[PDB]
Design a protein around this ligand. Structure first.
Ligand SMILES: [Hg+2]
Ligand SMILES: [Hg+2]
Ligand SMILES: [Hg+2]
Ligand SMILES: [Hg+2]
Ligand SMILES: [Hg+2]
Ligand SMILES: [Hg+2]
Ligand SMILES: [Hg+2]
Ligand SMILES: [Hg+2]
Ligand SMILES: [Hg+2]
Ligand SMILES: [Hg+2]
Length: 213
């Protein structure tokens, strides 16, 4: 119901999940399939009873994002791997605010997203066809509204048009999570003032996911 750190943490975990999947992709050319399936499905599922239902109704679906979030909030080096994750997450947040403020853009985007039903009729969500249709939406709708997210990794890997397509489609997911984040009370100032509460809540969810330990 009312603004709470549990929902804010999940939505933040979605933005970090996008960021981390882009990073696996750019360095290795492959990413966690289960996490990507979750992130891609959050773009298209128009049934959102709760924040968590956006990601399929299970906390396990965001594990990647929750673990990433812990470094993005706290480790915060200016170099190395974690500094890439931080730069991607802040770029996503800056782009979503441009999208939210740009007269008309959010209506356009919703229509373009619903329009993936044209392709989903004949092609699965993870196909090269869907990946390129979702990348086209990111590129046509979102990327002109602000600074480009500069993606770094192995340059040879990144010349693949299929890697490029998946990158862009996953960036669309991170935008979709940032939209949710603001819808559940999240924002810039909240994030500067509530860090330890987000970190603690994410640690709690990961402990809840791992009763083995
Ligand atoms: Hg994040
Ligand atoms: Hg690398
Ligand atoms: Hg990926
Ligand atoms: Hg993947
Ligand atoms: Hg089709
Ligand atoms: Hg058809
Ligand atoms: Hg048809
Ligand atoms: Hg989106
Ligand atoms: Hg906001
Ligand atoms: Hg439980």
């Amino acid at each position: 119901g009312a603004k709470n750190y549990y929902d804010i943490t999940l939505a933040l975990a979605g933005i970090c999940q996008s960021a981390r999947l882009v990073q696996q992709l750019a360095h290795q050319g492959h990413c966690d399939a289960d996490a990507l399936h979750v992130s891609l499905n959050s773009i298209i599922d128009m049934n959102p009873s709760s924040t968590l239902a956006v990601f399929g109704g299970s906390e396990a679906n965001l594990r990647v994002g929750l673990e990433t979030l812990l470094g993005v909030l706290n480790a915060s080096s200016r170099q190395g791997l974690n500094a890439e994750l931080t730069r991607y997450t802040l770029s996503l947040m800056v782009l979503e605010r441009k999208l939210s403020s740009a007269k008309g853009a959010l209506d356009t985007l919703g229509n373009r997203i619903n329009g993936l039903q044209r392709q989903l009729e004949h092609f699965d969500l993870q196909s090269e066809t869907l990946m390129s249709a979702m990348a086209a939406i990111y590129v046509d709708v979102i990327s002109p509204l602000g600074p480009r997210i500069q993606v770094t990794g192995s340059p040879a890997v990144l010349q693949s048009p299929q890697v490029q397509a998946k990158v862009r489609a996953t960036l669309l997911a991170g935008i979709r999570a940032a939209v949710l984040w603001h819808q559940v009370g999240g924002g810039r100032l909240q994030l500067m003032f509530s860090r330890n509460r987000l970190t603690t809540q994410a640690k709690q969810i990961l402990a809840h996911l791992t009763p083995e330990l």
